[PDB]
Amino acid sequence: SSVALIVGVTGIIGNSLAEILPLADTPGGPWKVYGVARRTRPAWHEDNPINYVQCDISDPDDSQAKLSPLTDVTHVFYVTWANRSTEQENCEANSKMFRNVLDAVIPNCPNLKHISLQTGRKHYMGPFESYGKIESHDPPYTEDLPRLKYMNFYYDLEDIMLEEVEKKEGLTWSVHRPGNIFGFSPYSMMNLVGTLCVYAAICKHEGKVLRFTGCKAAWDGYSDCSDADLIAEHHIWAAVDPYAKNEAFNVSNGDVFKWKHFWKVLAEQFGVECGEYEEGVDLKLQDLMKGKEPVWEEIVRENGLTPTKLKDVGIWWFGDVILGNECFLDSMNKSKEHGFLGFRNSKNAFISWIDKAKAYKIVP
C-alpha cells in the first residue's frame, strides 16, 4: 500500500508528482499523497486533492511536529532546496533541512521503503559560484564520473542519505539529476518556461520584438532539457523498479534542440516578432526587465491574471545563467539500461508548458 511524502509540493517537480501520483494507472498505486511546503496552497482546482501539510523543514521543531504523525509514509520524494549566496552556505542550510526531514520520518514510519533525492547536473559542473572559474567534466555526463574536488551541497545531501539509510534495514534510495527543467509552477525559484513567458508577455504588451538574450553557443549549439512530468515519472519509476534501487540516475528528454528554433516557437505562441542573434552586443534579461514591475502589474490587471509580483515569476538571473552559457549534455544510457524508457519531444513539451502558464492565467 503506497503512501508518498512530496517535500516541496508547490515546486516545479512537486507539482507534477502531485498531479501524477494519484492517477488510477500510476505504477505503485493507488497512492496516498502528503505534500509539504511553507506557503499556503494556491486556490486552484485539483482533480485529485492531496493531503497538504504546512511546514518549514529548516526548523527542527516544526518538522518534528508536522512530519512525525505521518506514520503511514512508504516513499519520500525530496524536491526542494535552499538558495544561498555562497556554496558553503548552501551546504549548511540544505543539510539541516534534509536531516530534519529524515530525523522526523525514519523513526516514525515502520513501512518506510524508499528515499528519492532530486539533485541535478551541477553534480558534474560544480556550484553556480564556480561557473567559468573551474575545470569541469567532459560531456556527455555519465553517472560513473567521480565527484569534482569542490564543495557541492548535492554531495553533502547524498552522504547524509547514505548514512541515514543504515538506520533502517530494507530502506533503499535513488538520486535524480535533471538539467534545465521545462515545467509549471509560479512558486518555483528556478523556472525557465515561466520566466520566458513573462518576458514574452511584456514584449507583446509593449509592442517590442522578442530580442534574444543570450550567447551564440545557446543560439546555435545543441541543448537539451528535463520535462517536469518526465522527471516525476522518473521518481515514480525508481520507487517501483528493483533495477532502480540504490542508484544515481540522470533525467533528460532524450532529444536535443537549438534556441534558434525554440525562440521562434516562443514568439509564435505570444504573437510577437522574433529577435535573431545579435552579434557583438550582449543582452541580459536582468538588464532589459529592470524597472518593469509596474508594466507587469498593468498586464495582470488588464488581463484578469493571477496576481503575481514580477520577482516571483520573472526569474531573470536563472534565465540569463541558461541562455548566457553553453549547454553541456548528459547521457540517458544508464536510465535506459536499468529500464526507464520514458522520453519527451522537447518542442511539443515546450508548447504544452507555455499553454499551461496561460491556462492557469500566469500570463495572457
Ligand X SMILES: NC(=O)c1ccc[n+]([C@@H]2O[C@H](COP(=O)([O-])OP(=O)(O)OC[C@H]3O[C@@H](n4cnc5c(N)ncnc54)[C@H](OP(=O)(O)O)[C@@H]3O)[C@@H](O)[C@H]2O)c1
Catalytic site positions: 122, 154
| φ/ψ (deg, to 5) at 205 | -60, -40
Q: Which of residues 115-134 bind ligand X (CB under 6 A)?
A: 118-120
The residue type at 262: F
Say whether residue 230 binds ligand X (CB under 6 A): no
Distance CA 162, CA 153 (A): 14
Say whether residue 10 binds ligand X (CB under 6 A): yes
Distance CA 197, CA 184 (A): 11
Q: How far apart are the first and last CA of the chain?
A: 42
For residues 105 and 67, the answer to whether their CB atoms sit within 8 Å is yes
Name which of 253, 239, 126, 247 is nearest 178 in CA terms: 253
Judged by phi (left if over 0) then psi (alpha if -120 to 50, else beta), residue 160 lies in alpha
* Binding segment toward Cl ion, per CB under 5 A, in 118-126, 187-195, 276-284, 335-343: 118-126
Q: Is 301 annotated as a binding residue?
A: no
Say whether residue 349 binds Na ion (CB under 5 A): yes
* Binding segment toward Cl ion, per CB under 5 A, in 116-124, 131-139, 233-241, 283-291: 116-124
Nearer to Na ion (CB atom), residue 112 or residue 349 = 349
Say whether residue 319 binds ligand X (CB under 6 A): no
Query: Which is it for the CA torsion 350, 351, 354, 359, positive or negative?
Result: negative
SS3 of 223, please? strand
Nearer to ligand X (CB atom), residue 189 or residue 295 = 189
Q: Is 11 annotated as a binding residue?
A: yes
Say whether residue 99 binds Cl ion (CB under 5 A): no
Q: Is 97 annotated as a binding residue?
A: no
Q: Which of 33, 36, 102, 203 binds ligand X (CB under 6 A)?
A: 36
E-assigned strand segments in 65-192: 75-78, 114-118, 172-178, 181-182
Say whether residue 185 binds ligand X (CB under 6 A): yes
* Binding segment toward Na ion, per CB under 5 A, in 47-55, 195-203, 214-222, 345-353: 345-353
Give the chain's radius of gyration (CA, Å): 20
Query: From the list ligand X, Na ion, Cl ion, none, which binds 320 (C-beta under 5 to 8 Å, kind-based)?
Result: none
Nearer to Na ion (CB atom), residue 71 or residue 352 = 352
Q: Which of 3, 11, 173, 316 binds ligand X (CB under 6 A)?
A: 11
* Binding segment toward ligand X, per CB under 6 A, in 144-152, 179-187, 207-215, 268-276: 179-187
Distance CA 258, CA 108 (A): 48
Q: Is 189 annotated as a binding residue?
A: yes
Min CB(349)–Na ion separation in Å: 4
Q: Which of residues 245-304 bind ligand X (CB under 6 A)?
A: none
- What 334-340 contacts at long range (C-beta under 8 Å, 24+ apart), as own/partner pairs, is 334/142, 334/143, 334/247, 334/249, 334/250, 335/234, 335/249, 335/250, 335/251, 338/241, 338/243, 338/244, 338/247, 338/249, 339/237, 339/241, 339/243, 339/244, 340/234, 340/237, 340/241, 340/244, 340/249
Distance CA 84, CA 91 (A): 9
Nearer to ligand X (CB atom), residue 62 or residue 278 = 62
**248 beta partners:** 175
* Binding segment toward ligand X, per CB under 6 A, in 12-20, 214-222, 275-283, 284-292: 12-20
Say whether residue 90 binds ligand X (CB under 6 A): no
H helix or E strand, kind and range, residue 357: helix 346-359
Say whether residue 19 binds Na ion (CB under 5 A): no
Residues forming the site for ligand X (CB under 6 A): 8-14, 36-39, 55-58, 79-81, 97, 118-120, 178, 180-181, 185, 187-190, 192
Q: Which residues are annotated as a binding site for NADP(+)?
A: 10-12, 38-39, 56-57, 80, 118, 154, 181, 188-190
Residues forming the site for Cl ion (CB under 5 A): 120-122
Residues forming the site for Na ion (CB under 5 A): 229, 349, 352
Q: Which residues are annotated as a binding site?
A: 10-12, 38-39, 56-57, 80, 118, 154, 181, 188-190
